Every structure is written in C-alpha cells, then in structure tokens.
Design a protein around this ligand. Structure first.
Ligand SMILES: *[C@@H]1O[C@H](CO)[C@@H](O[C@@H]2O[C@H](CO)[C@@H](O[C@@H]3O[C@H](CO)[C@@H](O)[C@H](O[C@H]4O[C@H](CO)[C@@H](O)[C@H](O)[C@@H]4O)[C@@H]3O)[C@H](O)[C@H]2NC(C)=O)[C@H](O)[C@H]1NC(C)=O
Ligand SMILES: *[C@@H]1O[C@H](CO)[C@@H](O[C@@H]2O[C@H](CO)[C@@H](O[C@@H]3O[C@H](CO)[C@@H](O)[C@H](O[C@H]4O[C@H](CO)[C@@H](O)[C@H](O)[C@@H]4O)[C@@H]3O)[C@H](O)[C@H]2NC(C)=O)[C@H](O)[C@H]1NC(C)=O
Ligand SMILES: *[C@@H]1O[C@H](CO)[C@@H](O[C@@H]2O[C@H](CO)[C@@H](O[C@@H]3O[C@H](CO)[C@@H](O)[C@H](O[C@H]4O[C@H](CO)[C@@H](O)[C@H](O)[C@@H]4O)[C@@H]3O)[C@H](O)[C@H]2NC(C)=O)[C@H](O)[C@H]1NC(C)=O
Ligand code: NAG
Ligand code: NAG
Ligand code: NAG
Lengths: 322, 82, 171, 322, 171, 322, 171, 82, 82
C-alpha cells in the first residue's frame, strides 16, 4: 500500500514571465492590464460630452457664425475637439491668453449664457448694424460673431462711451471683447471717425488700455486689418467698466460658469455614442477594474494607470505540469 | 432556458452581498460571475474567478470557503438545468 | 524551483486532482482516489489574494489627467511638461513590469514551499511506518484502510498503534 | 533525556503587515513613520522666524503703515504668513512680478535696510509732504508707505527730475518704486501739473518707461485712481537711474540682501514659540530621525520624507507565538 | 512559513527564553533551563540592522521644499507644478508602503530559515545518538549531562564517544 | 569509498553589497555602472559639433564681428558653449525671447544662411554705410553685425520704408532684426531725422509695433543708447513685412532651418577632438552598453541612465569561499 | 545562507573545480578528480542571465536630455524644472541602488538553493547504499568504480543492483 | 533617586562614544537610551533599542555584542538603585 | 604573433553571428571578446564573459552551451599559438 503527495495541473495555456525565465506556463493567473476599449465617446455621470465638431474653443465662445449648433449648449461632461476644429477667429487677429482660457474651461462643467449688454437698449448713441464682414460670412452674407457686437460711428461721429456691468450672478462670469486695428488712417476715419481713439477696460483685477495700431499687413481672409480678442473672469460682486472712443468690439453675451472637477478637453475623431462609461479616453471608453491600461495616457474620469506595457499577467496558480 | 436561468443566477449573486452593500450594489460583478459560470465545470476554477472578480471591484478579500460555497451552488444549478 | 519539490522530486502534476492546489493520491486494498488538502490550499489562497490586493490598492486609480496646450513661445514650459509626463511614465511602466516579474518568481516559489512542507508534514507523521520512494511517495509497512488515510490528511494519524505491526513487516 | 530547538516569544502586541497577510503580531519592530509634531513654530539654527502677522510680503517691503512692527526686522530663519495677512498694497493697483519677488525672498536669510534717497536732501525742487492718502490711514490720518516717497508738484510746477543710485553695498540691492495713474486729466493737473508726464527707469538689466493711464475705474478704498508697484535687484556695482516728469513714487528705503539656502515662506496659523528644532512644518515642528513623516509636505530644514501613509512598521523580530 | 519551522514543525515560541531570538530547552537528570544561541542570534541581528540601514540611508532626508505661488494667469504652470508634486508623492508613498510590505515578508522568512538551519545543525551533529520526535525535539539514547549539552550548543559535540553506548540502548 | 557535493570558488576579489551584508566577496559579477569617460568632445553620427568658442548663441546668429569663424558654419551634431562665450550683443540692449530662441535651436541640426534683403539693391532711398559703432569694433575700427544692416537718414531725410519677404525656401526661416533707441532727441535727429518714428513688423503670426524710447541710461561699452533684438520663425509660404519711419536695424542674412532630434546645446571646456562616439556628455564621451552612468546628467545621443551612485555591481556567481 | 548549504553544511568551495558552478569530488579505488554538473550549472546560468536582461532592458537608454535656460524673471519655472530633475534622479538612483541590493540577496540565495537541491538529489538516489557524513559527503558501503560514478552524476544510478551487496557491509 | 541616576546614566551613554565623536555629540540619542531603560527589564530588548536608536541617528551599525555589554551595565545599575 | 592571431580571432567572433545580423554587425562586441580572451585561461570564465558581453550589447540571451563551445575554440587557439 502507498500514499503520494502531488500538485494540481490542468490544460491551462496561460503563460507568465518571471525574473529567471520567460513564457512560463501556470495553472491560474490574472491579467492586470486592460488593453481593450469600445472605440466610442460616451457619457460620464450620465452627462453627454460637448462635441465641438468643426469649431474650436475660440470659435465656440465668440460665437463664430459657423458654430450655431453650439448656441444652445449649457452642460457637458467634457469637451471634444476633432481634427477638423478649424473655425475659431474668422476675423484675423490674436486671441490673447487663449491657452489659459482653455485651462480655465478644463474645470467648467456647465454654464448659463446671458445677455450682458442688450444690443437694443445699451448703446443709444452708437451704430450697431454695419458691423459685419465678408471675413465672417454665413450663408454667403457678411455676418459676425453671435456673442460680440461691433460698434461703429453713427452718421459721422463716435462719442466717448462708458458702460459698466455689475456681477450679481453669484459666480464667476467670463466676459469676452475685442479691439480693432484698421490697416489705414482713412479706414479708421470711415469706421470710427477718430484718429486718436482708445479702449480702456477695468474691473477690480483686470485693468488695460489699448490703442489702435494702424498699418498694412498681408491680407488674411481678404482683410489687411486685424482684431484682438480678450477675456476676463469677473469675480462675484465685481464690476467691469468699458470706456472707448473707438475700435471696441463690445461684449453681447457672457457666461456664468459652474465649476466641476474631472472635466477636460480632449481631441478625438471617435464617434460620440449614447453609451455610458466611468472612464473615457480619446480612443474609446474603458469599462474596467484592472489597475493598469495601455490604451491611452489621456483619460477623463476614473481610470487604470496608463503604462507602455503590452503584457502584465501575474501568476496565481503554480507551474502547470501535466 | 438561459433567459430565466440568467435572471435567477444574477438575483442570487447580488443577494450573496459579501460586503453588506445591498443586493443591487453588485450588478457589474454579478455579470462577470455569470459569464465565468458558462466557461467552466470545476467548482474550484469558478471559486477562483469569483474571488478575483470581487477583489478587483472592491479591494477586499472574500473568505475562500465562503466563495467556494457560492460556486458549488451555481455549478450544481447549471448542471441541474443542463 | 527553490524548494526542489515542484518540477523537482515530485516531477509532475495531476491533471486528475481538480478540487485543490495540493493534495494526495492514495492506494490501498480498499480503492484509490485523489484528495486536495483544504488547509494547505486555503492558506495559499488567502496568501495570494492578499499579495494581489496590496499590489492593486496601492495603485491610485488615475483620475482626470489631460494635456495642456502651450503657444509657440512657450516651448520651454511645453518641453518641461513633456519631460514630467514621460518621466513618470517611464517609472510607472518600469515599476509595474519589474514588480510583476519579481512577484511572479516569489509566487511560484511560494507554491514550491507549500508542497514541500506538505510532503515533510506527512513524512514526519508516518516515520518508520513507511519508506520514502523519493518521488513524493511513501510505501506502507502495514495495511492502511480508508479510515487510516483520513487521519493522515487531517493530521491525526496514530503512529504507536501501528508501530508494532509495522516493525514486524519492515524488518 | 531530551533537547529541543525553539524560538523566542514575548507579550509584545506590535503588529505589522506583510504581502501575504495583514495585522501580523511580531516580537520586535521599528516604526519608520513619524506622525507626531509639537504644534508650534520654532527657531532653526537658533534664528527665530519672521512672523508677518496681518501683513503680507508686499505690505512688509513697501512699509504699509499697518506693518510698523516689521520695521525693525533684519534676520529670520524663514517667513510666516497667516490666514489674516491682508495688509499689502493699501493704495489700489498691481504689484508687478509679485510672485517672482516672493521666490527671490524664499532664499534671503537676512538684510540691511538703508536710506537710498534721503527724503530731506535728495529732492530740492519737488514737494515731498502732501503725498498721503486716506487709502493708507494710520491712526485715522492720511498716511503712506514707510519705504516709499510720493513726490508731487511744488507750487504749480513739476520739473524733470533725474536721480541715480550706485550700488556699493557689495551685494544685491532690492529697489522698489511705483507709478501713479490718476483717474482724470484735471486730477493729473492738480497733482503733477503735466498732462504728458512719463517715468523712465534704467540700470544695466532693468530698462522700462511708463506713462500714466488716466481713466475712471470703480473706487477701491475710496480711490478711483491706481498705483503700480515695481521692483528690481540691483546687482553689485550697478547703477539705477530714475527719470520722470510726473507720477513717480520714488524709493526711500531699499534692502541689501543676504542670501541663504533653506529659507522659505510658509503659511501657518500655529503660534510661534521659543523652542528650537531641526525640522519645521506648517502644523508644528518635528524632532525626528525617522526616514518618513506623514505630517505635512511643506517643510523647512532637514526633514523625513513626506508620504501619505498612516503606518510603516518594519518587523525586526519574528512572528510572536506564546 | 516558507521553511516550515516557525509556526510549523516547531509550533510555538518560548515566552520563557529572554536572552535571544533562537535557542535550546534542555532536560537531563541534572536539571533543566533555557539557552539562546548567540551565533544564530548575532548573525540574524547584524543582518536585520543592515537590511534596515540600507532602507533609511537611501532616503534623502528631505531638505527645504516649499510651495510656489502663481497668479491667476499662471494656471497652467500652477497645474504643472501640482502634477509634479503629487506624482512624486504617489511614487514615494507607493514605493515605501510596498517596500515595507515586501521586506516584512522576507524578514519573517529569514527568521524561519535561521531556526530551521539551527534545528538541522543540531540534527546533523547528533545523528543516531538521538531520535527526532518531530516538534523540534530530539530524545537521547544516552545520558547527556550539562557538560555534554554545552558541547552541543557551541558546536563541538563528540559522536564517536557515545556512539557505542548509544547503539546498545537504542536497539 | 566516498562522493562529495561542493561549489566553485576562485581567487576572485570582486565584492558586492547585499541587503543583509556589505562588501561580500563573490566568484563572478557584472558592473552595471559606467564611471569612465574619454574627456574629449566628439562627433555623433559622424557630424562634428559646433564649437562657438568665445561667442554665444546671440553673438553667432547676429554675426557679432568677433564671430567670423562661425560665418561658414552650416551643420553640426550639437552646439558647444564654453566658459568664455561672452561675445553676444556688442551694442547694449535686450535680446527679446532669447531663452526660447535657444530652445528652438536645440532641435535644429543644420541650416542654410541666405541674403534675405541684399544690401546693394533693397534700399535705394536709405543710407546703409554709416551704421557702424565703436561698440562693435573689429580690427580697431567701428564695425557692425554681419547679419544685420543699420539703416540711417540719407542727406537729411528718412522716408517711410516698406519691405516684405515671401518664404519660398520650403521650411521655417529664422529672421532677426533690431529696434534702436537713441539716448537723446537731438541724437535721434542726427541719425533718423524724425522725432515721431516707429517700426512695425508683421507676418501671419508675428505682429508688433515698436516706438523709440529716448532717455539717458548709464553708458555701456561707451554707449548711452540701447538696441533691442527680435526674431521670428517665418513659416513656409508666409510673408514678413517691415515698415518703419526710423530706428530699424533691418535683416540682412536669415536662416532656413533643418530640424533634427537629438541635437542640443551644451556648455563644456573640454577639447573637441576627431573621435566618434554614440553618447556625449559635457565631461567627455562614453562608449558603453552599461545601463547606468554616474558621469553627468547632461547627455547628447544614446546614453546610460545617469544616477548619483558610485557602485552598482550585481553578483552573478556565488559567495567565494576558498 | 537561507538554505544552509553554501557556507553552511558544505563549509567551503573548491578552488580546484574550474569547469562549473556546482559539482562533485569523487574518491574510489580507481582514482580521484573533480566534475561540474552541467545541468545544475546550465539551469543557474540561463536563470541569472535572464535576471540580468530584465533589469537592463527595462532601462530606457537615456536619449537626449539637456538643460533649459531661464531668465532672471523665470526663477519659479527655473526651480520647478530643477525640482523635476532632481526628483526623478533621487528616484532612479534609489530604485537602482536598492534593486541591486535586493537582487544580490536573491541571487546568492538562488545559488544556495541550487547546491542544496543537488546534495539532496544525490542523497535520494543513493539512500542506504551510503551514509551521510554531514559535510556534503556520502560514504559508500560498496565499491563504486568510475562507471558507477557517471551514472550518479547524470542521474541514472541503480540502487537495487547494489542494495544486497551494500546491505551486507553496512550491518 | 532619578535626578542623580539620570545624570550618571547620561554621562555614560555619551562616554560610550561608538563613533569617536566625543561624549557630547550623542546628547539626543542618550536621552532616547535613558527613556528606553525605564521601559524594560530584559537586557536583550534594551540592547535592541539602543542599536536602533544609534542606527537611525547615525546610519551606522553598532556591533551587537558591544551594544549588549552597555545594556547589561545599565540594567544592572537600574536594579542596583532599585 | 598577435597581429595575425588578433585578426583571425576577430574574423571568427563576427562569424559566430548568434543573431543572424551578418559578420560585420558585431565589431564592437568582438573586440571586447578578444580582450577578455587574453585575461584568462579558464573556458568557463571566458564563456561567462562572452555571454555577458552579448547580453549587454543586444539584450538577448545566448544559449550557455553555444557560448561555451566558442570559448573552447578560442582558448585552444590561444594556447596553440602560445
Ligand atoms: C470655417 O472653416 C472653414 C474651413 O475649415 C473655412 O473655409 C475656408 O474659407 C477660406 C477663406 O476664404 C478658404 O480659403 C480660400 O481658398 C480659395 C480657393 O481654395 C483661395 O483662392 C483663397 O486664397 C486666395 O486669396 C488669398 C487672399 O488674398 C490669396 O493669398 C491666395 O493666394 C488666393 O488668391 C483662399 O485661400 C478655404 O478654401 C475654405 N476652406 C474650406 C474647405 O471651406 C471657413 O472660412 C471658416 N468660416 C468661418 C467664417 O470661420
Ligand atoms: C489692513 O487690513 C485691514 C483688514 O484686514 C483693512 O481693514 C479694512 O478697511 C477697509 C477699507 O476702508 C474696510 O472696508 C469698508 O467696510 C465698510 C463697512 O464694513 C464699508 O462700508 C466700505 O465699503 C463702502 O464703500 C465702498 C467704496 O465705495 C462701497 O463699494 C461699499 O459698497 C460701501 O459703500 C468698505 O467696504 C474694511 O471693513 C476693513 N476691515 C477691517 C476688519 O478692519 C485695513 O484697511 C488695512 N489697512 C491698510 C492701510 O492697509
Ligand atoms: C568680445 O568679448 C570680449 C571679452 O570677452 C570683449 O572685450 C572687452 O571689451 C570691453 C569693452 O570696451 C572692455 O571693457 C573695458 O575695460 C577697460 C580696462 O579694463 C575699462 O577702462 C573700461 O571701462 C571704462 O569705461 C567704462 C564706461 O564708461 C566705465 O564705466 C569704467 O569705469 C571705465 O572708465 C571697460 O570696462 C574689456 O576689458 C574687454 N575684455 C577683454 C578681456 O578683452 C569684447 O568687447 C567683445 N567684443 C565684441 C565687439 O562683442
Ligand atoms: C512561448 O512559447 C509558445 C509555445 O509554447 C510560443 O507559441 C510563443 O511564441 C512563445 N513566446 C515567446 C515570445 O517566446
Ligand atoms: C488587528 O487585529 C486586532 C486584534 O488582534 C484588532 O484589534 C485590530 O482591529 C485588527 N486590525 C485590522 C484593521 O484588521
Ligand atoms: C571591504 O573589505 C576589504 C578587505 O577585505 C577592504 O579593503 C575594504 O576597505 C572594505 N570596504 C568597506 C568600505 O568596508
């Protein structure tokens, strides 16, 4: 009679690497590396992302006429730019501190747009209707940004304007405006009458004065002129004051911002779909409890640690020897 | 058929409730256990899958014998309907 | 490999023993069969699960991390940013691939250890009431029916009882 | 007769974690994690820290009248701001490159303040005594910064001034000054007479020209005007030259800086006490040789590595089995 | 647990042996008592101290590290800064908690090893002049007074001397 | 008869450290730490580095007259500054965004310099020959940068100039220019005639307007005046337009840039030699396949990981016991 | 030290055995000599090479990394940059020095294990056809010429053949 | 009493001077050793505390038997005054 | 002499070609093997050097016995010319 000691083996083909040998077959193991995704863009916390499409952040917030789909947008879980987000500033010029603005936005989860200076009642002494350009066509007509108002001379005069806004929305307000720089002195006169015009803007934190830089530059979208775009976050209770004797592209709509965490801007050409996920990447969503992923370093939500590895399988059972 | 067997197996997995979270807190993990069930006939392999399933989801080790008990009921039930 | 048992003096596993990681094959007059050792197995599992949880829980699930943009005059900060990202990534990749490698060695050796300790557990219980073949097998110098077997697995085998009987046959 | 092998056990209750099991009782162990501090702010190298109290760095260096306790300060081991450090610039305006200045200061261990341009003898052609404001009251009277001198018109004229300083102190000198921007043209005239005034400042490294930006802004501390504050580090042997036809708030006192390492600015509401330590944090000092601490990531001196852990105990003895 | 000795074939420790980590319990006609093995203990300690020093000395005491401030238009650099700080912290926390965990396993196993090697050290010295009970005990087949004991602890036990005497009693 | 088991030992003196003991002698081991270098600066990919010598990047690109050796330079594997690279801007002033420019250059592996605005034919209405200074002497004569052209008044007039360049080189072009700021109004008149002069420069991306800041500053290299230097990368197909009524130091030569990776600027006083290496550091080259090096944290090419360690020897054989 | 063999029950190495890491010293009537065990050695080497490759290949050769310059108003970013560089360096230095330390322990223990397993490999083959001296030596109870030796090294030693012959001499 | 016993024990600890730093270089470590002394009666536990105390402070391993000798003098002395 | 012995030993090392890269892809590693050859008389030490030389250069483990074969030819040849 006899008794023997022994250990389990099975038909398992799982292999793992160890420090002394590679490609070792074991009886059980666990994969620690998620390497699969669903190729779509999904909701998070059940909120759909904002797909900007052909517009970019600048084009969105100014209301480039090419961006009318975005006019109704108010909450999103994150923001998606694509390879074709080319509609931004349609009138050529610099958008000042643009990268910082995007950063601010990476932590805004929703907002309420509102009419800061109603076109019809705020500007009784200035022209509000000739401020369109072939540079911002829409339906083949000269048109303009939906969130800004281009003021020009009435008859043959541009009197000094002074307009202030007090923030009673209970949260930060994003205010955008522009400063126009005609290419010639005679053009300056045609639009604003005054050669020595300036724009001054002030609140508790922002305080800047701008003057027109008139000069010939190469034409961009047919325009030898330029327009600069500026923005500020008006703190609760704060006031913003605009003063100008010309060249001001005044705010029309502004944005009361709701802050969140875990929001962000991603760039992806993957289709948005109605699925829901806890972790989103630019290639597609991940539905995983694995500690690691090698899908993408950019993630929104709660995700596995990104690593370059192609394989992380930890043996749990023993060397498999049938 | 599976439609009915699937609904029952899932109800049970939730009811196991190893962490006192309520039967509805384990819906994700329960599907993973159901899937794993159709992939084997060995109570031991299955007992191992479950424990792993629940350790990733919850960062908490389930007593082996407790897990092992659940697996036995499920494979008995799989065979009983098949 | 460290403890000489798995793929050592016990050359092979039992595709046939499906209820546990370690166990026994018994042959007496009353019949054969395979039996896993719950205690050995139970201990190994609580151990391995804990090894794995410690590894997973140490890993911060990664919360939102997205790119920053920089203008064409922010090339230095842009590169600093990239240096940061890649450096952390070289590291997490490195610790992770290396950790798994090292831990896999230890896990497998852990199993070797469990088996060896099980063999020698049995060996010390039986003593001269059996001889060691040298392949994880013991030959009895007495009849050991299934009742006797059970005592051996669950730890309560009685040596004195058979020491006499075994002493006669052996010499 | 018999002999047995065995191992020590005792009544030790210390537990440690291992990779295979938690809460294991061992016979001896060492804690590697300091998790206790003395709740006070202490000296380092026997030098007391500088407690700014209600002032902040800006308020200190300009000599906000609310900061007179700091007037006598010259060496410190580190600087302490509190939750109430609100006295900074009492005349509203921007302090230019303020964060950088704080960074410079984080490596200054001491200084000698001195009278760069003595009020009584440097400015024979200008008014030095009407440059006070209700915005910087002190004892209910209009007053002003102790380190700056507000020059105004004498009678009805502000002649062009030109004043230079050569650095013979053998070390870097911190020079501060301001530029004033009245809210109206008529106010400009009242103070400085000249509508077209400018301020120009130059040394080997700094070179800037400023002109007044006159405009209405919301009132801050009663003031619709603004004042900008500037600073520079004048290198050894270098000269600084101020030129102005108005609007200059001239340096009065400046600072010859002594550099050290291991200094810093911390923010803490913990009481300063007379104890001495090797390692200071914002919660309190640590007197430890342990390699780790979980008290605070901000430290001055020589400290244990901060980690988020609540427990790091390394077994030294064996599993305790009585 | 790896070597089967501590909490294995020697089931328990001796709350009674206070002068060392490993040692002996002896019973002869001349009296009992407990005796620690300095060499085994001395070796284990130099070992563990070194394990601990290497861990501590690798750790740069942390010299001055303080926050930076950034203005409301330096939000990107501000976040870059924070990403740096937290990332290094995830890492130092992770290496540290994990290092201690792994090292604790090794330390305890180190002790198991020391004990086992001590048992088998004695076993190889005595040979057939005693039998193994199987619980860290040996029974002598001859009278071993306290003089004989000392030789055993300090390594110089003489087998031939008692091999004859022991051969008679045993059979 | 007898048989014994045993293990190898030899006369090896190699020691390694382990966690339980230091200075352990083993039978075989490998060093993982390269700690030796050849003390020279070498080629990479067989391309010699650019040794700037007494000039620095600014001095090189402007063509400081002290830098004529660099005039013929066109490709390099990396750039070497020394402890004596002091010849930069010889006319005192600020080189704007200089650190960024160096960063751009750290990824340029070669270029073709060319005559953007030929001195002899581009400027028929302006003086090109009186624009020399004792501040940039060369051979004891007033001289000037080789890559820039200092335009001044012809007779007693400086008419408005307007000059544009279109980029047809198929790659980015680095354009440099300057803006001059005389110290006095009368000096302004002597050089440019016009008191109210300006310089305006524009392309698709760059757009700036400069005006002269006339004021006395301390003399530097005999000069109370200042000159500012500016640069831009003109993208393919883009145009740059200069307009000025004074004070412009116009581009003469510019650089079409060839990008590479793995280039860089290092500072070293080690001699350049004709050897070839795969890995270069500021102390000397490394010819190694070891994973680590403790020679220097700055490297060009493919290098071992820098670590502070003095010893990393991994035992391969066993404890050596003869 | 863990397995008790190297610098343990086999007190010393053989400066004389130059063709391998582990092996045999044999003495019979027909002559002495030293012989390395290729299989034991071959296995240890593939093992150690792999341990070393995994360590090296995980290490990104360092591609171009050069300093950045910052102006006298970029002191914060300058310090952020330096904080990044030094932090990664503390880490790579720390992982590296510590990794080698830990791995060296494991490598040496690996060798101890290989030797012990070799001893016990031989011990289980011979059984009572020889006695254990206790110093890595076995004494035969029968004549074992060089032919017999070879069978032992390459694993094929025949016990039954000599079990009778050995049984007589021994008792 | 302790006042006198405390001063003497401290003088000695400094005088032990394991690293050739002078008796006054160890004042911090000496208090830690004194404290540890009143916490035990086992020379072995105490020998362990000391070595640890000095390893953290100085990053240097004290010979065990040397430490063990110091502890024996101190516990003999503690009992001798108590 | 070495001049001729050096050229031949080098030709061979390249020809060994363990990774199917052509004889000319190993010029650096071959010198390292040549150098190592003049530093020992034990085939085993040398077999160890080679394998290490090639593992650093190529991140790939050469079969021990294959390496061991090359070393034997080279030391036989070194002695044969000396
Ligand atoms: C929203 O984004 C879309 C693209 O994503 C953008 O559409 C573009 O409009 C521009 C601007 O007019 C188009 O550019 C022109 O293309 C034609 C033919 O291809 C050229 O002839 C034009 O250049 C001529 O004139 C230039 C100026 O003087 C000269 O420099 C040049 O040499 C030519 O003479 C000009 O390049 C562009 O083709 C479209 N693209 C598409 C695909 O529609 C649209 O403008 C954006 N809308 C807004 C309002 O933001
Ligand atoms: C040193 O710091 C202390 C605080 O830490 C600071 O004390 C503050 O002084 C200000 C400035 O005058 C006080 O603010 C006022 O509070 C009263 C009543 O609370 C308000 O009526 C005032 O606002 C009126 O006027 C404003 C301007 O037109 C209007 O906009 C407003 O709607 C009101 O009509 C004003 O807010 C403040 O209360 C004190 N705080 C304390 C606790 O003392 C002191 O000024 C600093 N000193 C210096 C010189 O730096
Ligand atoms: C190329 O770089 C070299 C150095 O690497 C540089 O050479 C330097 O030229 C300067 C500028 O003229 C020299 O500086 C002078 O040195 C003399 C005597 O040492 C001093 O008298 C001069 O200062 C006087 O005038 C100053 C201005 O008013 C006063 O402030 C001062 O107090 C004195 O009265 C002045 O400092 C310098 O010595 C040389 N150095 C060397 C070693 O040659 C050369 O100019 C660079 N060339 C170019 C064109 O880039
Ligand atoms: C692992 O070995 C298997 C066969 O057992 C083979 O299919 C696979 O390609 C091997 N992998 C590697 C990379 O060695
Ligand atoms: C450790 O077990 C002890 C009792 O032995 C108990 O007091 C303590 O709460 C346990 N800790 C954890 C978190 O398991
Ligand atoms: C290592 O010991 C050797 C002598 O065996 C000695 O030369 C060397 O200095 C020792 N190193 C250290 C730092 O202990």
């Amino acid at each position: 009679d006899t008794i023997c000691i022994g250990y389990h083996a099975n038909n398992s083909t799982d292999t793992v690497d160890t420090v002394l040998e590679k490609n070792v077959t074991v009886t059980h193991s666990v994969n620690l590396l998620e390497d699969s995704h669903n190729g779509k863009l999904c909701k998070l916390k059940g909120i759909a992302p904002l797909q900007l499409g052909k517009c970019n952040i600048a084009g969105w917030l100014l209301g480039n006429p090419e961006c009318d789909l975005l006019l109704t947008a108010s909450s999103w879980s994150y923001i998606v730019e694509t390879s074709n987000s080319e509609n931004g500033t349609c009138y050529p010029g610099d958008f000042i501190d643009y990268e910082e603005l995007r950063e601010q936005l990476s932590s805004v989860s929703s907002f309420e747009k509102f009419e800061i200076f109603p076109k019809t009642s705020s500007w009784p002494n200035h022209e509000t209707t000739k401020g369109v350009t072939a540079a911002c066509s829409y339906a083949g007509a000269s048109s303009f940004y939906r969130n800004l108002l281009w003021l020009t001379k009435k008859g043959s005069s541009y009197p000094k304007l002074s307009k202030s806004y007090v923030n009673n929305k209970g949260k930060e307000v994003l205010v955008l405006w522009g400063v126009h720089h005609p290419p010639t002195g005679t053009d300056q006169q045609s639009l604003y009458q005054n050669a020595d015009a300036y724009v001054s803007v002030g609140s508790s934190k922002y305080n800047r004065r701008f003057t027109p830089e008139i000069a010939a530059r190469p034409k961009v979208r047919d325009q030898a002129g330029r327009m600069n775009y500026y923005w500020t976050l008006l703190e609760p209770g704060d006031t913003i004051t605009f003063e100008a004797t010309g060249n001001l592209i005044a705010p029309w709509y502004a944005f009361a911002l709701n802050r969140g965490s875990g929001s962000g801007i991603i760039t992806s050409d993957a289709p948005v779909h109605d699925c829901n996920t806890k972790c989103q990447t630019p290639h597609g969503a991940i539905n995983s409890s694995l500690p690691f992923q090698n899908i993408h370093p950019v993630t929104i939500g709660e995700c596995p640690k990104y690593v370059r590895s192609t394989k992380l399988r930890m043996a749990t059972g023993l060397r498999n020897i049938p | 058929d599976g439609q009915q067997l699937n609904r029952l197996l899932l109800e049970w997995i939730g009811a196991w409730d190893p962490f006192g979270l309520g039967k509805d807190a384990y819906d994700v993990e329960a599907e993973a256990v159901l899937q794993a069930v159709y992939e084997t006939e060995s109570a031991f392999d299955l007992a191992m899958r479950i424990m792993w399933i629940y350790v990733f989801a919850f960062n908490r080790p389930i007593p082996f014998p407790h897990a092992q008990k659940l697996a036995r009921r499920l494979l008995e039930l799989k065979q009983a309907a098949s | 490999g460290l403890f000489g048992a798995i793929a050592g003096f016990i050359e092979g596993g039992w595709t046939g023993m499906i209820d546990g990681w370690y166990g026994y094959h018994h042959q007496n007059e009353q019949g054969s069969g395979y039996a896993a050792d719950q205690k050995s197995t139970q201990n190994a599992i609580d151990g391995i699960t804990n090894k794995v949880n410690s590894v997973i829980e140490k890993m911060n699930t990664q919360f939102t991390a997205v790119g920053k943009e920089f203008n064409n005059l922010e090339r230095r900060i842009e590169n600093l940013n990239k240096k940061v990202d890649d450096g952390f990534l070289d590291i997490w990749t490195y610790n992770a691939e290396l950790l798994v490698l090292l831990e896999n060695e230890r896990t497998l050796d852990f199993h070797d250890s469990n088996v060896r300790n099980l063999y020698e557990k049995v060996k010390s219980q039986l003593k001269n009431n059996a001889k060691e073949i040298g392949n994880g097998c013991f030959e009895f110098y007495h009849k050991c029916d299934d009742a006797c077997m059970e005592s051996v697995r669950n730890g309560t085998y009685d040596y004195p009882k058979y020491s006499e009987e075994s002493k006669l046959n052996r010499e």
